[PDB]
Write a protein that binds this ligand. Structure first.
Ligand SMILES: [Zn+2]
Lengths: 79, 457, 80, 66
């Protein structure tokens, strides 16, 4: 009866968010995706456009994190 | 792979996004690039978890802590809290100066007796022509720490420049009240009870008028300083009227006058969040012939009307005067009970009944003499009273005559009894809180205010 | 003006007596103009019997006697 | 309440038993509260001796909550 929002992080390998959307028993609404600058999200958008219209997907990117070398960018990602 | 559910922390479950917002760099349809201005939430979470960990670490011996917030301190600070206080270290002096304090023994007529304060009080009179000529009694050599004690006569004569010789003028009295309140606020005191003798200042006015002026001045001072959270005055002041007893002369009609005035005034003003008359005091010259049980039929009316009583006892008398004050006059607090240790049964009775004891280190040193730095009057009984369970507090008595404040009094108390710790100072503050003449709501508010105001090392 | 201290057969009445005596003393000290309304004494009235005679209230009136205020007593209406 | 007042202020009692009439005098109740004097009540004995209403159905109300 709850809205049951889903929150997921995405790497350089897509087709994980479509998989995790199919939890056996959950009626997900407003899937949220958190990712970096580089990786592509066309596959996820096409999936949610063709198989689940009313789910209002949102995608968020961290402004200056594309690869990690020091600990500084991990902290900004966490914040 | 289903790991399971989670609960989280109660004060982070709901929170609000307005406190920690996100900044959008650029946005197309259903895609965003975000940025955080700073790392406030990280510090918030870190200190929250640190507080939780410290509270978990210190959960036992929590009933033994005078205040609850001490359970949020680290192990090192708690260990530092148990070490003997060092009066000579600047850090300890600053720590003592920063503590919230409660005052219970302060005479109004002995505040501005020397120096610039006397001149400021004098240059406020409504009738400067009637002012007595200026004169300042000369203090003994090394006055704050005299080499030899002096009797009470010289001690009282040391404040002849102020008091009955100066407070007949309404302006002088009003300025005296303002300056005392300013000093109390500067010292960090959050609650104080002030003793006064209004009938001594009435010559053309009635004692009712003098008391009304004093109460109005203190109330206006409280109204002016609405600092502190909740919109409450920085310092709260209540009043106690003195019944003075003398060696010879006419002094017993004035006593009845003060008690009647106190009863009427206590019934007059009843607002909880305002200056009020909360008790009576029996002070003055003490000996065998003027013991507390000779004034019982005068205090029967006060006992009928339900007012609290405090008695000066034990300063210049054996434990018999203390016993008579406790059991014949139904006293709730005791002043300068330096001879309480002579009787074990009386000490047990006082400890069991919860009767408070009030000591003034500087005045006691100046009048009786006591060894400093652990180098005959005997040892100063503060540690004995703490160990036996007595509700004992440290006060200032006469600020002007003794030339010392509450911070100096606490430091000198540390000097009189080597081995006194800072936790002992916190226990003294708690004792003063539990012994004060106030309502339960005010007591709870004061406890909450004091607990979250103790500075860290 | 004269202020009454009332005694009753049973109940709570002594606190009111002490209150009235203290108020009388304070008021007599307050207003002192000769050509004006003034409080000039106290009264001991109310229920009277063997157990509520005058000598049971001496300690309450010692203060009135110290302050020098006149006293009048209801006596003899229903007693020997 | 006169007996309670005399017990408190003339015999220096530390606890009071069956002080059912303490509420008649507000000043004495305030004094007892301020000084921390204990009060002892015995529900069954008080009900059997003085009589008291049950379930909110003249001794008056039972003074525990007050
Ligand atoms: Zn004093």
């Amino acid at each position: 009866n709850v809205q049951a929002h889903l929150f997921v992080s995405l790497g350089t390998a897509p087709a994980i968010v479509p998989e995790a959307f199919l939890l056996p028993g959950a009626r997900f609404v407003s899937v949220h995706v958190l990712t970096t600058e580089r990786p592509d999200v066309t596959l996820i958008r096409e999936f949610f456009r063709r198989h689940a219209p009313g789910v209002n997907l949102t995608i968020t990117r961290v402004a200056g994190f594309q690869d990690l070398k020091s600990e500084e960018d991990h902290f900004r990602f966490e914040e | 792979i289903r790991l399971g559910p989670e609960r989280g922390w109660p004060q982070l479950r709901r929170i609000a996004p307005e406190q920690f917002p996100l900044q959008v760099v650029e946005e197309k349809g259903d895609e965003r690039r975000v940025q955080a201005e700073d790392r406030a939430f990280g510090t918030f979470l870190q200190d929250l978890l640190q507080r939780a960990s410290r509270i978990a670490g210190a959960w036992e011996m929590l009933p033994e802590l005078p205040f609850a917030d001490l359970a949020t301190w680290s192990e090192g600070e708690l260990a530092w809290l148990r070490e003997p206080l060092d009066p000579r270290a600047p850090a300890d002096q600053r720590w003592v100066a920063g503590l919230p304090k409660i005052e219970l023994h302060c005479h109004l007529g002995g505040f501005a007796t020397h120096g610039e304060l006397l001149r400021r009080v004098r240059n406020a009179a409504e009738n400067p022509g009637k002012l007595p000529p200026l004169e300042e009694p000369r203090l003994p050599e090394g006055w704050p720490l005299p080499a030899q004690p002096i009797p009470l006569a010289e001690y009282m004569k040391l404040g002849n420049a102020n008091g009955t010789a100066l407070l007949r003028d309404p302006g002088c009295l009003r300025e005296q009240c303002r300056l005392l309140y300013r000093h109390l606020v500067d010292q960090g005191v959050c609650y104080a009870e002030v003793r006064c003798s209004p009938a001594n200042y009435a010559e053309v006015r009635s004692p009712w008028d003098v008391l009304a002026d004093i109460r109005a001045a203190f109330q206006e001072c409280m109204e002016g300083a609405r600092t502190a959270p909740g919109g409450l005055p920085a310092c709260h002041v209540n009043l106690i009227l003195i019944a003075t007893r003398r060696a010879s002369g006419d002094y017993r009609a004035a006593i009845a006058r003060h008690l009647a005035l106190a009863v009427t005034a206590a019934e007059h003003w009843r607002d909880e969040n305002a200056c009020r008359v909360v008790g009576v005091d029996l002070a003055g010259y003490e000996d065998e012939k003027t013991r507390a049980h000779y004034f019982r039929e005068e205090f029967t009316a006060v006992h009928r009307c339900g007012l609290a009583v405090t008695v000066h006892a034990g300063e210049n008398d054996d434990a018999e005067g203390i016993w008579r004050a406790v059991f014949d006059l139904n006293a709730r607090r005791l002043g300068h009970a330096l001879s309480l240790g002579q009787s074990r049964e009386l000490l047990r009775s006082v400890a069991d009944r919860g009767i408070g004891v009030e000591l003034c280190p500087y005045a006691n040193l100046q009048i009786k003499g006591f060894r400093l730095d652990g180098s005959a009057p005997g040892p100063y009984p503060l540690l004995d009273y703490l160990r036996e369970g007595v509700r004992v507090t440290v006060n200032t008595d006469n600020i002007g005559i003794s030339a010392a404040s509450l911070t100096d009094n606490l430091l000198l108390a540390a000097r009189l009894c080597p081995g006194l710790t800072r936790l002992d100072l916190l226990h003294l503050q708690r004792h003063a809180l539990e012994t004060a003449f106030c309502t339960a709501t005010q007591r709870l508010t004061l406890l909450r205010r004091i607990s979250s105001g103790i500075p860290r090392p």
